[model samples]
Target chain A: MLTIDYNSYRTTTPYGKRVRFLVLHYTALDFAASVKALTTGAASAHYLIPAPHDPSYKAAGFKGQRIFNLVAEEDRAWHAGVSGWARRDNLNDTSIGIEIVNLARDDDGVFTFPDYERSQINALKQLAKNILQRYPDMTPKNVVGHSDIAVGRKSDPGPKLPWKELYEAGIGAWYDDATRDRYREGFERDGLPPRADLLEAFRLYGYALPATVDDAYFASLLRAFQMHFRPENYDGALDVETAAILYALNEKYPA
Target chain B: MLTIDYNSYRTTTPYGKRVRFLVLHYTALDFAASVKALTTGAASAHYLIPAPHDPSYKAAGFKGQRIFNLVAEEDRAWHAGVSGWARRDNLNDTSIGIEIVNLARDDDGVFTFPDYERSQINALKQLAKNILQRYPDMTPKNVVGHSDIAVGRKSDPGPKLPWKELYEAGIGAWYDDATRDRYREGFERDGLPPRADLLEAFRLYGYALPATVDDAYFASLLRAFQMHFRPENYDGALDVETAAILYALNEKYPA
Candidate 1:
């Protein structure tokens, strides 16, 4: 039986009734960072893993971490800030927020994360596996990063964290970058669009984009868009290669 | 007029036609910071703004910014990392990259930016406006934040950015959050998805969610989804409120 301790807050919403998504975040700040300094009073996550080396850092890591435990079962954690997934809105009440213990530095114009602890990865995998088993309906596609949740405001777990590893470990979604490159090259071969309708389909596919929609910002958004999909060559040019990869990914993923 | 300086290491492709988008980013480091750093080495943009507040900040600010005035008007800049937009790809090739003068940092977890001078914003706006004029079909939605372009990795111009302010100043998209919220609430009250299908709709909506497609990841994604759209209550729980908001936004936005 899970012990319910309501210090400042707790809800009886019943896990079955509330959420359907799981969000991943790296606590860029160490565990010792003052809580008051972490977030505004109205916000906080359901669980916070202090370090990747927590007891749950091994094959049994998931079962060992406090945060992992909460997520493994049915309990909504205060995570996932103001965000939206696809067309759905208000994810906090229906999602689980898991904060990986990490420290990221977005220096000058660069972003980097110190490598995660081996134990932490194990712990995360275990926890994710447990969550999957319990939910029985979750998919790797449903697992998202915090930055994915808060595009303009957040950059947690930075790029140093190995997302691809997670995907390979059967915890998240990932496609072969090399294969994706082939598609991107193919799109580059196809003709590019003029400014007006270029990003319409891209925004439709779910990149963080402006609604009123202008070309300058569109380009800005497109640059970042290129980073992930057309990674090897993110020139923001929307060429045949990049387009091919994007089209292929959309065709395969549809979101 | 913009000058073209080609680097041997950077990827330069034929700039085919008129551009459709313009991507912007703050080179989160100072000009004093070595440009030869790991990610910075081969990364080049159409325009590069000097560090905002470095000792030579003023000269670097906007006075000495680099503008590639005559690159085929269709070349690619080696800027973005791993990224993508809706359907378009190879953003650097399709869009212009503007490197802002700033050091992207986390004051703890709070990212801080050196405020942009009127000269800087004005110059950028004017340059962007000229591009839009060149491309008559552009709209507000096309102008996007770096995060919008590069989801899951980069966060430039940080959250303190006045994206909405730019819109208010006749730059990008601007809509009444209140109005959007009203729409969001209506959908939740009137029509909510059946439990089994909710997750699918979410993935379709572009959330990186679980593959099992259970309530855990589903509800979480929905919370972020609401934060982006509804902006009222971000609780992930699927109460009548979330459903109403989702339906309402779809009706109004239709995307």
Candidate 2:
């Protein structure tokens, strides 16, 4: 049975657009471990979608995927630590985080990120749609990955996850192919715009700019950008491709 | 007239082997604004070195660059905010910060870093050498830029600063060219070392690696390394040169 648990202890004062963002993250562990860590530990998330072949299937009477609502929608979860989006800081107070059970990276630290199961992605689409309906202020643009908000600090729901599929499902933001192609050609021919101009474009597209314009911090923001928009090659290098994507995104969704 | 003032109010508890590190920072403004900000603002440092041709030259009858001892070397200054180096945290407790007057970046954000005048550099050499004499625990390697401890967030004492001259003058750390060449050849032929192994080398060489092994954070650490060791290009990309310099530094000085 699909159920939502209202944990009274996990809530706080809901002030000024409490539910503005929906952030996605990978548990970096199997289903069993993810459940234990999220519930027992200090960190909590609003929803958790289990992986395929998870032990819960036999006990719950044959299910493809299960969604555990550990905290209520109105209350904030302890996920999104030291995070920000757009101009906002400490996104825990303003965002609803969804933890999807997947070993995003290897214990060996090779960083070969894994894709979400088909069943889990389907479940996420429905859950995100439902959540969006309840919060009128929430939009496709507000949906982000944990890595997007935290930048260098976190890399969950990594490049392997299909953000385009979610966008197609009316759950997240994406740019049109025509717009991307147009900008890609220009940026390539002109050899990537000025760093300041590109940075302004990125901020306009709602990625938080680092306090210092150090090359590394700017690259971190670009890594977060590519993780969502251009996942095929997220080397974090500021190439024409990265610039093209940023320009197109800003054109489509100006902050 | 290289006189050092002993300000008593700017000190704190005399705990731990104090004065282990000497951190350098650019004031990010002209001499007058820098002096006013340091004196009136909450932020404080051990010494303030004014730029050449500063208006203070006329009033104080100072012929060359002047080093103002705002805070005594024994007392901790409120510098090095949210900082760390290697295993150490809260570096303000252990490190002595020296603020150099220079507009590191332009208002247009072009990062046209200014050159330290001959007088200023000469003063710094004497000042740093004098500080090292008092604190035997402080090594040439212990002298670092503000950007070194607080990676990504700060970029004062930017690339234009002549670290080689300082190193030659027995003020800071520098690697042997022969060692660097050997490593560079190896890295170029081998196509760079494994990411994990390189990260280990960086940590061993006294860099504070990011908590997570996100590609972006690792790149930031590399950028910090390049800013000091390779300065010609610090785009934060993990190239053969970046890896080579890191390897050479670690071989020379292992933490």
Task: Give each model's whole-structure lDDT.
Answer: 0.51, 0.73
User: On residues A121-214, what C-alpha lDDT tens digit does candidate 2 reach at each position?
Assistant: 8888888888888775677779999988888888888997888988888888898889989999987677787888787787777777775788
Compute the lDDT of residue A244 as modeled in candidate 2: 78
Candidate 1 lDDT by residue in tens digits, B165-227: 566666654455675567556554666668666654443333334356556655545554444
At residue B90, give the lDDT of candidate 2.
Answer: 59
In angstroms, give how far residue A46 of model 1 lies from its true place.
Answer: 3.0
TM-score of each: 0.40, 0.47
Question: With candidate 2 superimposed using the best TM-score fit, by how many Å does residue B41's alpha carbon deviate from the native?
Answer: 41
lDDT of 2 at A14: 16
Instruction: Please write out the lDDT profile of model 2 over residues B52-158, one tens digit for every residue.
Output: 67665445554555667765554456668887775665566567788888777746745577777777777778888887877766766688887888887778778
Clash totals, every prediction: 148, 0
